[PDB]
Amino acid sequence: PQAVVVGVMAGEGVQIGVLLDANAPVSVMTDPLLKVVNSRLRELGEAPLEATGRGRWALCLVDGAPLRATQSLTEQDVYDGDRLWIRFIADTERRSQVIEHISTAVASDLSKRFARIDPIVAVQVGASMVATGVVLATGVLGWWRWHHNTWLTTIYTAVIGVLVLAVAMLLLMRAKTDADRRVADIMLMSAIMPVTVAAAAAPPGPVGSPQAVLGFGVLTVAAALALRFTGRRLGIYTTIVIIGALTMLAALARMVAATSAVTLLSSLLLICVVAYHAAPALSRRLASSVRDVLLQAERARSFLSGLLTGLGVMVVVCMTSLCDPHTGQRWLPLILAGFTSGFLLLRGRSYVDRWQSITLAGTAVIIAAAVCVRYALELSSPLAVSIVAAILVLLPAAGMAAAAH
């Protein structure tokens, strides 16, 4: 315990392993330490460290935060095998500017700390507004199809889909930089929705199972096509493909022949339940040499996050539909939902990622809350709402206390 070995980072990126005294104060070691790293750099033939104007030499964490000069290395939470960084930190002292006339002062000050609008952001705003407009257009066009069996809905939506897709192609080819690519992506992704309903609206007669088969099918293809040719925005496209694929299976079965929805919903629930265990394997396999490895790594991490999200959406829709408050042994699906939620609530710790762990934990909470709220709406009475309120308010309070304590 008298000494600890740590890796020290020096100028421009050389790492050196050193055995430091665990109890002397850090300020006593920084000077001779600087000499040693320079000697090794001199022997290697690299440029040694040198001072520039006004500043001082410091020892910092890899995060850059400096260590207290008077405390002992053991007094700080530094353990054998850790790593540190020696650095030159410049002087910040300077004159203090002043402006006595208030009106001028407000302008000269306010213009430094905040950002004003510019042409680069402006295009993203306009692009964002047109994306919103078309998804609104499909909604009203879709509502008309629910009362009339005429060809108008498919006829109108098809031309929009073509025009929107047309503009995106030009931008994709003319794009030069990431900002430019953002604009193209937003435009391209916005075309899938009109094209999708344009197809699903084509089959005549009252809307239902036969139309559903077309919609989710072309949707799956469209998302897969964009993902294949673009190779960007992996997370969202992955999700659309998953939910589209599973929904098409249900649509086809229900369209051909199905004894009950409970049977289909139960099948989907089981498929989703097992998919959670397979997700990490699927994600890992779906994915100067360092560039390829880093690119591979983020692509994989991206796939798992999207994969988890697609599964989370399906279970809450099925689960809340299965636990009917009037059908048969009403208590059976309620406790089954509990067991299913407990599994997800516990499983969240198996993943290191912040957002991945949060979505899983939230998936359980949202199911419980959604299920609880339904029992307030249906089979309504003062007891029901009163109980739903007490449960929902205590529920998270217990979880927060259990996590903070």
Partner: protein, 74 residues
């Protein structure tokens, strides 16, 4: 003294204050004070014209009521 409390003031002082208010109001919105054109005043006078035109129509409606009296169910 320190100018505290209510009192009396000249016309020269009143426009002076009314000018500093406009200049400072511009700074918070445009972040500049050259005021090559002063849109603040122009935009306000348009409101006055809008209100004034509305009152003129009220006076117009009032005179018609004296030229040819009538009444409405109530």
């Amino acid at each position: 003294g320190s100018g505290y409390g209510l009192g009396l003031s000249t016309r020269t002082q009143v426009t002076g204050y009314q000018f500093l208010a406009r200049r400072t109001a511009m700074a918070l919105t445009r972040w500049r004070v050259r005021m090559e054109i002063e849109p603040g005043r122009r935009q306000t006078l348009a409101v006055v014209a809008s209100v004034s035109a509305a009152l003129v129509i009220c006076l117009g409606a009032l005179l018609w009521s004296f030229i040819s009296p009538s009444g409405q169910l109530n």
